[PDB]
C-alpha cells in the first residue's frame, strides 16, 4: 500500500 | 554534483546456445543521474524492438536499468550493448562475451 | 519523435517584454521550424529556419499566438520531425485590468476551496486565471454578463501547496482572444495548515482604553521563522520575523499603536523560503476599545 | 524467513527539456508488482505482477489517488529545493524517496523506513523508533522542524505499523508461490589463461531467487576475499538471478582453489572444483 507525502 | 558512471553488463538471460532462441540482456547501474540511453546492437546496427524496466534505484540511491531483448544467437553475429551517459564523452560499446 | 517545445521565462509575457522559443530535440535545441495554427502545416515567417532560439524582443501583439514547432531531421523521409506539444503565447497589457477578489478569503483551509472572481466593467469575453513562476497555461472561463459587468468565478481547490501563491487575472475581448489585458492587482492566496496553531496573547491585555497602544505576541514551541497577525474582516495583515526567547520558544510582538478600536485578531506561523503556506490559526483574540 | 515492502519513487527537474517526470515503482522481497509513470498515457497505477492484477477496482483507484498526490507533492518540493539550495531554475535536479517495512515469518513488523535523497544524497530520513528524523544537511533540517510541527512522524509511524505491514501479508498470501518460493543456482565453471603463469577461474550462478547468495572462493580451504573479483547479482529477465566470483590464479595451482556457493534454495552449501 502507497504512503502518504508530505511537502519539503 | 554526485554524478556516478554506469557499471555495464551485458549477458544471455540463458546459457547461450547458437540457433536456439534467448533474450539478450544489458544491465546498466549504479549510475547518478538517472538520464540515460541504452541501445542494443548487432554487428553494430541499432536493434529495434528493446524493453526495459521501470526505473528503480539500490540503498546508495543510485540507479539501474535492465534493457533487454529476444534473439537467436549465431557463431558469427556479434551483439553488444551501447550505454551513453553524462559521464561519458562518447558512447560506451561492450560486446556480449558468449564464452566468457 | 516529437520535439519539446518551451517558452522562457514565461508564455504570459507582457507587451515590450521579452520570450524565448526553443524547440529541444533529439538531444539538442537544434534547428526547427515554427507553426501557427491557423496554418497548421506551413511553417511562419515564409519557411524561416532558427538557429537556436527564437527570441522574440520586445514583444508585441503579433506575436500572440498558439505554437508548434518541428526538428531537423536530415536522416528522414521528410526532413523534419512530427509536430511538438502546442505552446500559447499570451501578450497581457493591452486593456485596462480587471478585478480580482477572493471568496470567502485568501486564507484557505487546506483541502478545502475558495472562489476567485474576476469582474470588469469592460465586457471581456474570457477571463484568465493565471499563478505567477508556474509555466502552466493560465485557467480560460467565458465572462458572463450581468447588468453591465463581466464576470467569472474561478474555483480553486481543494487547497494544496501547489495552488499557493501570488494570483492575477486578465480579460480578452472576442476576437483577439491571445491578447490580454493588463493584470490586475495581484491576490495572494494562503494554504494554512497543517502545523501546530501557535499562541496569541497580548500585553498589557485585551482591554485597552482609547489612546493607548497595546502589543500582540505570538508563541509557539515550534521552530517557525515568521509570524502573521490578521485582523478579522480586515485588510490589515502583517508579518514579523520569530526571535527564539530564553527558552527555545519562537516569538514576535505585533504594537498596534493608539487604539481607534479593536477587532479580534488571529496569528499563524510561517516557515523560512515557504511564504504561501500557514499554520494554522491561533485561538482568536479580541482586543475592546473603552 | 524474513519479508519486505519497498516502494522506490524518483522526481526529475528537466527545464527546457520537458516537464517534471516522476516513476514510482513497488517491491516485494526482489519482485516488482506496480508501477507508476506520471509521462505514460494511463496515468494510473499499473500492474506489474501477476499476483497483485486480481486486486479490485477500488484497491486501483485508490493506490492511483495517493500515488498521484505523491507525484505532484514532490514536483512541488523540486520548486522548494530551489530555495533551499539557492540553485538556478535552470538546472535539472533529482528527488528520490524510499518507503516499506519489514515483516519475519513470524507475520509481523521487524522495522520500517521512509527517507528522501536530493541529486542523490541522503536528505532526511525516519530513524528506527519511527519517532525522529536523521537531516542530512542544514536544508532537511527546515524540513524537519517542518515535518515536527506537522506531526508528520505520528502519521507515517502508524501507516508502517498498520497499512503497511498488513498489505504486506496480504501480497505475501497472494502471491506466495512466486514470492515464497526458492529456486536454486545452478552452477558451473570456466577457465581463461591469461598468461604462461596467469589463469582466470570463473565460477557461475544461474537462475537463483531470491536475490541474495554468496559466492566465495577458497585456496587450501581458507578464504581470498579480497583476491577474488564479484561481480553485482543480474536479473536473467525471468525473475531469476545471475552471479559469478572470480579467481586469478598461478598456472598449474587450479587444483588450489575451490568455489562455495550458498544460497537459501540449496539444502547444503556447493564447493565446486574445476577440471579441464
Ligand atoms: C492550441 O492548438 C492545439 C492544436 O494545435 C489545440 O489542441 C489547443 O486547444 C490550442 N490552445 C488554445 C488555447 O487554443
Ligand atoms: C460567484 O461567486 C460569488 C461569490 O461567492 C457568488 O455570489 C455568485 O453567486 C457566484 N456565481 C456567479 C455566477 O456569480
Ligand atoms: C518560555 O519563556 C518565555 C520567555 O521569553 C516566556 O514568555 C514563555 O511564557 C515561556 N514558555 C511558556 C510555555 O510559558
Known sequence: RYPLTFGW | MIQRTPKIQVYSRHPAENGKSNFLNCYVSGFHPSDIEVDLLKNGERIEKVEHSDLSFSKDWSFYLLYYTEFTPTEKDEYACRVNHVTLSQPKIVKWDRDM | ?290 | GSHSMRYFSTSVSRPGRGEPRFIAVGYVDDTQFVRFDSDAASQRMEPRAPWIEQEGPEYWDEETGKVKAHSQTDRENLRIALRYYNQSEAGSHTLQMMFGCDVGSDGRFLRGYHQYAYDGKDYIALKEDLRSWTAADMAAQITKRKWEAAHVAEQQRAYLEGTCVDGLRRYLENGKETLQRTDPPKTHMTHHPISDHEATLRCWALGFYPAEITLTWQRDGEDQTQDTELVETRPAGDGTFQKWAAVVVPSGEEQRYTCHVQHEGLPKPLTLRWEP
Open chain 3, 1 to 290: 519523435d516529437k520535439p519539446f517545445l518551451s517558452a522562457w521565462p514565461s508564455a504570459v509575457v507582457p507587451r515590450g517584454g521579452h520570450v524565448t522559443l526553443r524547440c529541444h530535440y533529439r538531444h539538442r535545441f537544434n534547428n526547427f521550424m515554427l507553426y501557427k495554427e491557423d496554418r497548421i502545416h506551413i511553417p511562419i515567417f515564409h519557411g524561416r529556419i532558427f538557429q537556436e532560439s527564437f527570441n522574440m524582443s520586445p514583444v508585441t501583439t503579433a506575436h500572440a499566438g498558439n505554437y508548434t514547432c518541428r526538428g531537423s531531421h536530415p536522416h528522414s523521409p521528410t526532413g523534419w520531425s512530427a509536430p511538438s506539444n502546442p505552446v500559447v503565447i499570451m501578450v497581457t497589457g493591452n486593456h485596462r485590468k480587471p478585478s480580482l477578489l477572493a471568496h470567502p478569503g485568501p486564507l484557505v483551509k487546506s483541502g478545502e476551496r475558495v472562489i476567485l472572481q474576476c469582474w470588469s466593467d469592460i465586457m471581456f469575453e474570457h477571463f484568465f486565471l493565471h499563478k505567477e513562476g508556474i509555466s502552466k497555461d493560465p485557467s480560460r472561463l467565458v465572462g458572463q454578463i450581468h447588468d453591465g459587468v463581466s464576470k467569472a468565478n474561478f474555483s480553486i481547490g481543494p487547497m494544496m501547496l501547489a495552488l499557493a501563491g501570488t494570483y492575477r487575472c486578465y480579460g480578452s475581448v472576442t476576437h483577439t482572444p491571445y491578447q490580454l489585458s493588463a493584470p490586475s492587482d495581484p491576490l495572494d492566496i494562503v494554504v494554512t495548515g497543517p502545523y501546530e496553531k501557535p499562541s496569541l496573547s497580548a500585553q498589557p491585555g485585551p482591554k485597552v482604553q482609547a489612546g493607548e497602544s497595546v502589543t500582540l505576541s505570538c508563541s509557539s514551541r515550534s521552530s517557525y521563522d515568521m509570524y502573521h497577525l490578521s485582523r478579522e474582516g480586515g485588510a490589515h495583515e502583517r508579518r514579523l520575523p520569530a526571535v527564539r526567547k530564553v527558552n527555545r520558544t519562537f516569538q514576535a510582538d505585533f504594537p498596534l499603536g493608539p487604539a481607534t478600536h479593536g477587532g479580534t485578531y488571529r496569528c499563524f506561523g510561517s516557515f523560512r523560503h515557504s511564504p504561501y503556506e500557514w499554520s494554522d490559526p491561533s485561538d482568536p483574540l479580541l482586543v475592546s476599545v473603552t
